[PDB]
C-alpha cells in the first residue's frame, strides 16, 4: 500500500496545483517516448493512467499544451500534470495524469480477428462515429492528430465509449507552413505523406480514419506493406492508378511516375458480401487520392452509415443505452453548422426549463 | 508476347515447355522444360515459383511479374548486365500471356537458393540463440562485395533487407536478389524517397530526401549486421518518428550540420537532445569489438561519412576470413572470397593490397 503524493496542476482551469495522492502503480503501456502506468487515486479510488515523458527543460511540451485546451467526451481527459525527477541524472519528467480507459480498438479488433469473427457493425458504427466527432472537434482548432490508428483509440467495452488518445504527434497546421512527412504509422499513412508532401492538411487524419473503418470491416489492414512502394501498390490496386492531377494534388514534386496502370477495383468486391452498402460508400468517400475530395469529419458523422445511431430505439448489445452521441457544441459544428439538422435527431437532448 | 506448351511427360507429370532468351549470353532462344512448380515467394509486384528443369533435374526459381507494354522492365535490364558470385544469376527470361486478359507477364528464371538470411536469423532468434559470428562475418562480407559490384555501375539496390539475401546453408554462399527497386542513381537527378523497407531505411530517406546516393544501401547493410548481432532489428518503429527515436537513442541527436547532410529541406528540428549511446552498451557482452566498430562506421548520419562497400570488406572485422586456415564450422572450405575483378575494385584499386591476402596470391 505504498502511497505517492505529488503537487499536481489541474489539467484544465487555473494553474492552482493541489496535493494528489495515489497508489497501486503498475506499468500498462510503453512507447519510444515514455511509459504509461495505472494508479488509483486515494481520495476517489478512481483509476487513472499516468503517461511519463522526458521533458526538455528549455522548452515546453507540445502534447501538454494541446491536451490542456481539449475538452470533449471522445478525447481522453487530462486530469492533472506534474513533474518528477529521474534519479538517473538531473533529468526531469513530465507526468500526464489521464482518465484510465480499459481497452483499445486494436485489442478488441484483434479478438474478433483471432476468433475468425467479424466485429458487429453496430460497434463499427459506434466507434467510427465517435472517432469522427473527436476529429471534428480537434480540427476546428486547426489541430491535426497525425497518428490516427487502432492503438490510439481507447475503448470502454461496457459503455461503448471511445476516447482518442496520444497527442504526442499532434500539431496545429497553418496554411503555408511546412510540416514533416514522417509522422503517422504505417498502414494508416495518407498517400500524400508516402509521396513526401510537407504541405498536407488535417485531411490526413480522415484518410487514416478511413483505413481504420476498412480494417474493422475487413478484419485486417487494407493497405499493408513493409515499404512505401508496397503500400502505394496496395492503394493503387484498390483505387486504381492516380491521375496526373491527383498526383499533383497530393504532392506536385515526387519524380517517379512509373506505376502499373491498374483499373479501380470495385469497392464492392473489396469487402465480404454481407458488408452494408452504406459502409462501403462512406469508405470510398474517405479513401480518396485528392485530399480536398475527402469528406470532412463532420460530414462523415452525418453520413447514412450512421443513421442507426440516430434511431430513438437503438440499444447496445449488452442492453445498455448508447453513450453520449449528440451533445454537439457550436465549436464542434463550426465547419458546417447546418449539419446540426441531421446530427441532432428530433428525440435527442430534449429538455424543458420546468 | 510469347507462349508456352504444356504436356505430360509420364505418370501424368505436367511438363511446361517455353522458348526463353538467355539472361547473359547472346540472343539465342533456347527451349526450356520444367515441372513440379510451387510458389516459394510473393510481393505486391508478383510471385516467385520453384520449378525443376526436366533434364538437368536442377531446381530454379521463376519470378513472374506483370509487364507494362508501355516501357521496358528496369529490373530485367539491370539483372541482364550483372555477373557476380554474390548476386543471384538470371538464367533466361520469357514472356507468358496471363490467361486473365491482354496482360503480359515477364518471367525471370533464376538460380534457386534454399534459404534467406531472414529465415535463418529467425530460426536462431526463436531458439533465443545467436548466429555464430563466423557466419555473420561470411554473410556480411559477401553482401558488401555484391554492393561494391553494383555500385561500381552506379546502380543502387534500394531494398537491402534480410529477405533479399539468399543463402546456401552448406556452402555459406550468400546471393543478393530482388532488383525490383534497383536504379542507376545519377547526380542531379531526383529519386523517390519511399523505397526501402522499414527498419532498414537510411535517415535521409526517413527525412524525405530525393538527392540520396548509393550510401543508403550501406546504412541498410549496417542495419542487417547489427540485427544479426542483436537477435532483433536495431531500429524498429511503426512510424518514421519512432524509427528516428530509436536511431537517436544510439547515435545521439544529429547536429544541425548532420541534418543538413541528409536532407536540407525538412522542418521538424524539435527532437529530444539525447547523448551518444556507447555502442558497446548496445550489444550483448563478448560481442567482438571489431563488429561494434564496423557498425559505428556504417550507421552514420552523414551519408558521405559511411564506409563504402569495398572499404567495409577491408575492415578488420573480416580479418578472420583472410586467414589461410579459416574453414566453415562443418569442416568445409569457405566460399570464393578473393576473386575480385577490376570492375569490382574500380572505386579504390589500392584496397586490393588488403582484400587479396598473400596466400591468395600464391602461384602454385
Ligand atoms: N488513458 C489511458 N488509459 C489506459 N491505457 C492508456 C491510456 N493512455 C495510454 N494508454 C496505453 O499506453 C499505450 C501508449 O500510450 P501513448 O499515449 O500512445 O504513448 P506513446 O507510446 O508515446 N505514443 P504511441 O506509442 O506512438 O501510440 C496506448 O496505446 C495504450 O494502450
Ligand atoms: N532465386 C531464388 N531462389 C529461392 N528463393 C527466392 C529466389 N528469388 C526470390 N526468392 C524468394 O521469394 C521472395 C520474394 O522474391 P522477390 O525477388 O523479393 O520478389 P518481390 O516480392 O516482388 N520483391 P519484394 O517483396 O519487395 O522483396 C524472397 O524474399 C525469397 O524468399
Swiss-Prot record, chain A:
Catalytic reactions on record: L-seryl-[tau protein] + ATP = O-phospho-L-seryl-[tau protein] + ADP + H(+); L-threonyl-[tau protein] + ATP = O-phospho-L-threonyl-[tau protein] + ADP + H(+); L-seryl-[protein] + ATP = O-phospho-L-seryl-[protein] + ADP + H(+); L-threonyl-[protein] + ATP = O-phospho-L-threonyl-[protein] + ADP + H(+)
Instruction: Give residue ranges for domain Protein kinase.
Output: 22-306
Where does it live in the cell?
A: Cytoplasm; Nucleus; Cell membrane
Question: GO annotations under biological process?
Answer: canonical Wnt signaling pathway; cell differentiation; cellular response to amyloid-beta; cellular response to interleukin-3; cellular response to retinoic acid; circadian rhythm; epithelial to mesenchymal transition; ER overload response
Variant or mutagenesis effect after changing residue 62 to A: Prevents the phosphorylation of phosphate-primed glycogen synthase
Instruction: Provide the tissue specificity.
Output: Expressed in testis, thymus, prostate and ovary and weakly expressed in lung, brain and kidney. Colocalizes with EIF2AK2/PKR and TAU in the Alzheimer disease (AD) brain.
Cellular component, GO, one term: nucleoplasm
Drop me one GO molecular function for this one: protein kinase A catalytic subunit binding
Alphabetical keyword list: ADP-ribosylation, Alzheimer disease, ATP-binding, Biological rhythms, Carbohydrate metabolism, Cell membrane, Cytoplasm, Developmental protein, Diabetes mellitus, Differentiation, Glycogen metabolism, Kinase, Lipoprotein, Membrane, Neurogenesis, Nucleotide-binding, Nucleus, Palmitate, Phosphoprotein, Serine/threonine-protein kinase, Signal transduction inhibitor, Transferase, Wnt signaling pathway
Q: What domain of life does the UniProt record list for this protein's source?
A: Eukaryota
Please tell me which top-level EC class this enzyme sits in.
transferase
Post-translational modification Phosphotyrosine, affected residues: 182
Q: How is the activity of this protein regulated?
A: Activated by phosphorylation at Tyr-182. Inhibited by lithium.
Chain segments annotated as coiled-coil in the UniProt record: none
- EC? 2.7.11.26, 2.7.11.1
> What is known about its subunit structure?
Monomer. Interacts with ARRB2, DISC1 and ZBED3. Interacts with CABYR, MMP2, MUC1, NIN and PRUNE1. Interacts with AXIN1; the interaction mediates hyperphosphorylation of CTNNB1 leading to its ubiquitination and destruction. Interacts with and phosphorylates SNAI1. Interacts with DNM1L (via a C-terminal domain). Found in a complex composed of MACF1, APC, AXIN1, CTNNB1 and GSK3B. Interacts with SGK3. Interacts with DAB2IP (via C2 domain); the interaction stimulates GSK3B kinase activation. Interacts (via C2 domain) with PPP2CA. Interacts with the CLOCK-BMAL1 heterodimer.
**What's this chain's function?**
Constitutively active protein kinase that acts as a negative regulator in the hormonal control of glucose homeostasis, Wnt signaling and regulation of transcription factors and microtubules, by phosphorylating and inactivating glycogen synthase (GYS1 or GYS2), EIF2B, CTNNB1/beta-catenin, APC, AXIN1, DPYSL2/CRMP2, JUN, NFATC1/NFATC, MAPT/TAU and MACF1. Requires primed phosphorylation of the majority of its substrates. In skeletal muscle, contributes to insulin regulation of glycogen synthesis by phosphorylating and inhibiting GYS1 activity and hence glycogen synthesis.
Leftover remarks: Higher expression and activity of GSK3B are found in the skeletal muscle (vastus lateralis) of patients with type 2 diabetes. Several potent GSK3 (GSK3A and GSK3B) inhibitors have been identified and characterized in preclinical models for treatments of type 2 diabetes.
The protein, known as: Glycogen synthase kinase-3 beta
- Species whose genome carries this gene: Homo sapiens
List the range of the whole protein covered here: 35 to 388 of 420
Amino acid at each position: 500500500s505504498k502511497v505517492t503524493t505529488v503537487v499536481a496542476t489541474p489539467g484544465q482551469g487555473p494553474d492552482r496545483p493541489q496535493e494528489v495522492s495515489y497508489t497501486d502503480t503498475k506499468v500498462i503501456g510503453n512507447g519510444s517516448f515514455g511509459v504509461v502506468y495505472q494508479a488509483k487515486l486515494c481520495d476517489s479510488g478512481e483509476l487513472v493512467a499516468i503517461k511519463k515523458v522526458l521533458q526538455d527543460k528549455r522548452f515546453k511540451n507540445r502534447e501538454l499544451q494541446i491536451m490542456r485546451k481539449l475538452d470533449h467526451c471522445n478525447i481522453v481527459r487530462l486530469r492533472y500534470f506534474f513533474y518528477s525527477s529521474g534519479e538517473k541524472k538531473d533529468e526531469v519528467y513530465l507526468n500526464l495524469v489521464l482518465d484510465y480507459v480499459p481497452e483499445t480498438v486494436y485489442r478488441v479488433a484483434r479478438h474478433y480477428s483471432r476468433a475468425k469473427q467479424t466485429l458487429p457493425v453496430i460497434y463499427v458504427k459506434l466507434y467510427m462515429y465517435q472517432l469522427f466527432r473527436s476529429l471534428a472537434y480537434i480540427h476546428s482548432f486547426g489541430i491535426c492528430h497525425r497518428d490516427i490508428k487502432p492503438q490510439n483509440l481507447l475503448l470502454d467495452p461496457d459503455t461503448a465509449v471511445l476516447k482518442l488518445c496520444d497527442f504526442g504527434s499532434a500539431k496545429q497546421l497553418v496554411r503555408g507552413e511546412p510540416n514533416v512527412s514522417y509522422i503517422c504509422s504505417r498502414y494508416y499513412r495518407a498517400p500524400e505523406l508516402i509521396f513526401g508532401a510537407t504541405d498536407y492538411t488535417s485531411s490526413i487524419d480522415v484518410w487514416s480514419a478511413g483505413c481504420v473503418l476498412a480494417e474493422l470491416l475487413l478484419g485486417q489492414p487494407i493497405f499493408p506493406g513493409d515499404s512505401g512502394v508496397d503500400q502505394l501498390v496496395e492503394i493503387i490496386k484498390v483505387l486504381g492508378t492516380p491521375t496526373r492531377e491527383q498526383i499533383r494534388e497530393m504532392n506536385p514534386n515526387y519524380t517517379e511516375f512509373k506505376f502499373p496502370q491498374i483499373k479501380a477495383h470495385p469497392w464492392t468486391k473489396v469487402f465480404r458480401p454481407r458488408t452494408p452498402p452504406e459502409a462501403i460508400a462512406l469508405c470510398s468517400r474517405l479513401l480518396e487520392y485528392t485530399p480536398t475530395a475527402r469528406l470532412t469529419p463532420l460530414e462523415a458523422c452525418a453520413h447514412s452509415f450512421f443513421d442507426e445511431l440516430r434511431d430513438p430505439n437503438v440499444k447496445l448489445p449488452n442492453g445498455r443505452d448508447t453513450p453520449a452521441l449528440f451533445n454537439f457544441t457550436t465549436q464542434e459544428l463550426s465547419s458546417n453548422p447546418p449539419l446540426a439538422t441531421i446530427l441532432i435527431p428530433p428525440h435527442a437532448r430534449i429538455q424543458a426549463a420546468a
